[PDB]
Design a protein around this nucleic acid. Structure first.
Lengths: 211, 142, 58, 38, 175
RNA sequence: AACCGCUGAAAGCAUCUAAGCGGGAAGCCCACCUCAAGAUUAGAUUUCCCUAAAGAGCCGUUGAAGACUACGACGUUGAU
RNA sequence: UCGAUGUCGGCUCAUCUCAUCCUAGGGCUGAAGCAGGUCCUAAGGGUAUGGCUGUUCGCCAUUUAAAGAGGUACGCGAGCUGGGUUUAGAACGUCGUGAGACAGUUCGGUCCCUAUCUACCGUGGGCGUUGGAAAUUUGAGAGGAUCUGCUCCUAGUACG
RNA sequence: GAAACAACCCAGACCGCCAGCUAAGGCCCCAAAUUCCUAGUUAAGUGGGAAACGAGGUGGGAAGGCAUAGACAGCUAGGA
């Protein structure tokens, strides 16, 4: 149930010999150093804590510097934790190594990332609200919300009403994506799909939960 | 001569254990509610908490009579339209055993800042053990 | 307030308030509930002796 | 079955049985005689 | 009437009551039933006479079922029970291999059924299942569960049916 | 749930039910995704620091982050 | 309620009920199969586009698994519209001597408000969380989502 | 007092009291006062909405018909 953290490198295509174009995305997979192994006895639950990337020393706090030093690993750009089980905590020891070898070609994986942020967005784009008449006497409410409720009964707006607000820039998971190719010497992970976020953003890849 | 209050600095709360194994839910909740309010004390004043700390063990073993285990319904509204939920006494006792007795007692107390303070002294646990041996609570069959 | 204080005091040693007031009435004891609640809350020995006089009367 | 406010035995091979506080009619002779009060 | 009738114990069988838990032992096996808390069980010379605690309609109604269930255990351990199933159909056939019986009635897949622990099935021919068990309850459920895969049809009689079960027959294409 | 049971008495029979044992729906509770300890019951683990420390902020260069914020990166030991 | 609670319809955006339209599970059937008919359970989702008319509706065309019945100030004009109704102009028919009138018709005819509180959608600041700090997190709970066609095969088999 | 409730029930406020008795209504907790006593009924949370009509729920009361010249039910045989 454990995965790895990567960085979105952009999209491309993979051509099959039969003459099909596969829309793929490239995920750079640096070393995932294991910074802590949490178990049911010390933490109440089993998980693996990993780090990847690098940070300069001036940008690493003393508390983090000691957290990494106990593991014996270099400070990464972030710290991510994967919920595991007894079978997953087999060869995973403190300061260990997690490469792209975790995945094999043809395996369905779950990729999570932060979506591109659109900022404040109206109901038309945020919630697929129908636009109102561009002509036919329509006043200054072309992309307006329309009605937001009923009359005196209930005399309020219900909670969860679809309205303008912040769009994107949220955690989003795409399921059922195939691993097109794995290359570990160069830290490659080619995956079929779209992978929420922009180029350069951190993405987490885990084995698919649907199965 | 005047009728004096309890002077919170001068009041002390005593610790007791109630083993809620097989006792009727409401017949016990009234007893706990009175003790949390401090109605058994001669210096009881309704604006000072003169109650006691009650530790309840075996909160999952509390009993209801009749057909109430399958028919007592616990509704709650989440705050969203159509957000009304329901659960049974037996389904709630199997998911949150302390919540059955905590909920009976809460409705039997005053509903206000002092009421919130005196339910904070009800330390109820599902099982035969409680983490309050430091307070040395005395056994109380109530 | 007095009745609740008296009820707690009587129940500490013996009977309830409803049986306490009946006992005081049968013993021709005129002590008001104001004074009784002050005895209960401030001198438990006297209230213990006072309950006994009501308890022997019923 | 027929689920109605009046359930009564029809032919003579019908039984009045109550299960779960509810009155049924069961017939070993005619399956369309099956009734339930409700 | 049922409750007052004593249960006669044959030579092989023996009944022991240990903490409100009747244990019936004999030649076929060991059966046990929970004695209701409103019924007392007393023993005499090779007979079991069980009576209610208090003389009430509810206690006389629960001692009638303990008498009946225990009498089934006595006979069910003395010589056991046996239920017969019949398959009617052009291709309806069943085969019993151990505790698992497979039957091919009309589906796009043979259905596999595993017998409850305590019931055994043997099929002499391919369209007739014979079930044997100690307790009548587990035998009856095993037969009801096999028969529920394809209950008998009212137009041709096809489907698993009990032996000596009256199957209602309806006429197709009437006017 | 409706519905169908097994064994079974009240009620010598019968009976899904009274004791006991089953099957059974896109419905309920989980399971999936997102948020979530202001869950004031404010939880847990790993480190770091305490004669202004550990850090955080201001400021600056800024960003597929963004109304302002917040969030992310960097500030010469540097590709912001 | 007349020191003012804006009328019908449309648009936009909904929320709930179940007396269920589809899908799901069943009993009976004058249930062979395929299709149905009734009644029980079931509200999780889903539940068209047009021509006509101001229309809601209704008729019709073509679909669809289905084109549900309702409540919500006959939901929703400080969200939009303004076709009808219902001002002032004008005309026809009709009534009136007439000024005029018509749940008769016809052509035409100003829709204001920068949001304080509640509510809701987002996004912050403060303080608290038994010294402080950097991170990682458990999950009491909350929300989202929940639809369905067709083809092949079983098998032209069961049934007829 | 009737949850809240001009018109219902109890009762007619001169003022003050940290005195007592009661009315209607009440006495497990919110919330003052009985987890009071005696004999029963209900198993429906009826109590704490709703009828014709239906049912083998359960308790009680006046009578009856049949019965060890074997009554009711079951099973066997006949039912011409």
């Amino acid at each position: 149930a454990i995965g790895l953290v990567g960085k979105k490198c952009g999209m491309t295509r993979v051509f099959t010999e039969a003459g099909a174009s596969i829309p793929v995305t490239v995920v750079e997979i640096s070393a995932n150093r294991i910074t802590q192994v949490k178990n049911t006895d010390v933490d109440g639950y089993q998980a693996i804590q990993v780090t990847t990337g690098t940070r300069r020393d001036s940008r690493v706090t003393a508390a983090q510097k000691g957290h990494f030093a106990k593991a014996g690993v270099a400070a990464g750009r972030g710290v991510w934790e994967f919920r595991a089980n007894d079978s997953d905590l087999e060869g995973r020891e403190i300061g260990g190594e997690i490469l792209a070898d975790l995945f094999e070609q043809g395996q369905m994986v779950d990729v999570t990332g932060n979506s591109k942020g659109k900022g404040f967005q109206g109901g038309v784009k945020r919630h697929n609200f129908s636009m109102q008449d561009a002509t036919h006497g329509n006043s200054v409410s072309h992309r307006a919300i329309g009605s937001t409720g009923q009359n005196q009964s209930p005399g309020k707006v219900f909670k969860g009403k679809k309205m303008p607000g912040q769009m994107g820039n949220k955690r989003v998971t795409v399921q059922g994506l195939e691993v097109i190719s794995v290359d570990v010497e160069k830290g490659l992970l080619v995956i079929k799909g779209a992978i929420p976020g922009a180029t350069g953003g951190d993405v987490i890849v885990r084995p698919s939960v649907k199965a | 001569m005047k009728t004096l209050s309890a002077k919170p600095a001068e009041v002390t709360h005593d610790w007791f254990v109630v083993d809620a194994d097989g006792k009727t839910l409401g017949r016990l909740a009234t007893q706990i509610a009175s003790r949390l309010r401090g109605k058994h004390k001669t210096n009881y004043t309704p604006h000072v908490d003169t109650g006691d700390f009650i530790v309840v063990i075996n909160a999952e073993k509390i009993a209801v009579t009749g057909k109430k285990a399958q028919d007592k319904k616990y509704y709650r509204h989440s705050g969203y339209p159509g957000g009304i939920k329901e659960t049974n006494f037996t389904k709630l006792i199997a998911h949150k055993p302390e919540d059955v007795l905590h909920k009976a007692v809460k409705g039997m107390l005053p509903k206000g800042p002092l009421g919130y303070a005196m339910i904070k002294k009800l330390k109820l646990y599902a099982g035969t053990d409680h983490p309050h041996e430091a307070q040395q609570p005395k056994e109380l069959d109530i | 307030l007095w009745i609740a204080r008296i009820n707690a005091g009587a129940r500490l040693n013996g009977l309830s308030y409803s049986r306490f007031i009946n006992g005081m009435k049968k013993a021709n004891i005129t002590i008001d509930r104001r004074v009784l609640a002050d005895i209960a809350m401030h001198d438990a020995a006297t209230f213990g002796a006072l309950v006994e006089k009501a308890k022997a009367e019923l | 079955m027929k689920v109605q406010a009046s359930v009564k035995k029809i032919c003579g091979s019908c039984k009045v049985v109550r299960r779960k506080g509810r009155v049924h009619i069961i017939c070993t002779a005619e399956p369309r005689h099956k009734q339930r009060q409700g | 009437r049922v409750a007052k009738a004593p249960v006669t114990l044959p030579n092989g069988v023996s009944v022991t009551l240990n903490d409100r838990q009747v244990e019936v032992k004999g030649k076929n096996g060991n059966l046990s039933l929970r004695l209701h808390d409103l019924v007392e069980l007393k023993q005499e010379d090779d007979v079991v006479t069980l009576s209610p605690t208090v003389d009430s309609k509810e206690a006389m109604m629960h001692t009638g079922t303990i008498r009946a269930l225990l009498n089934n255990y006595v006979i069910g351990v003395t010589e056991g029970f046996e239920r017969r199933l019949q398959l009617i159909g052009v291709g309806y056939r069943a085969q019993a291999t151990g505790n698992k019986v497979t039957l091919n009635v009309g589906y796009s897949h043979p259905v596999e059924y595993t017998l409850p622990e305590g019931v055994s099935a043997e099929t002499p021919t391919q369209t007739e299942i014979v079930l044997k068990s100690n307790d009548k309850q587990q035998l009856g459920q095993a037969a009801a569960k096999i028969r529920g895969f394809r209950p008998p049809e009212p137009y041709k009689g096809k489907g698993i049916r009990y032996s000596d079960e009256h199957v209602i027959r309806k006429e197709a294409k009437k006017k």
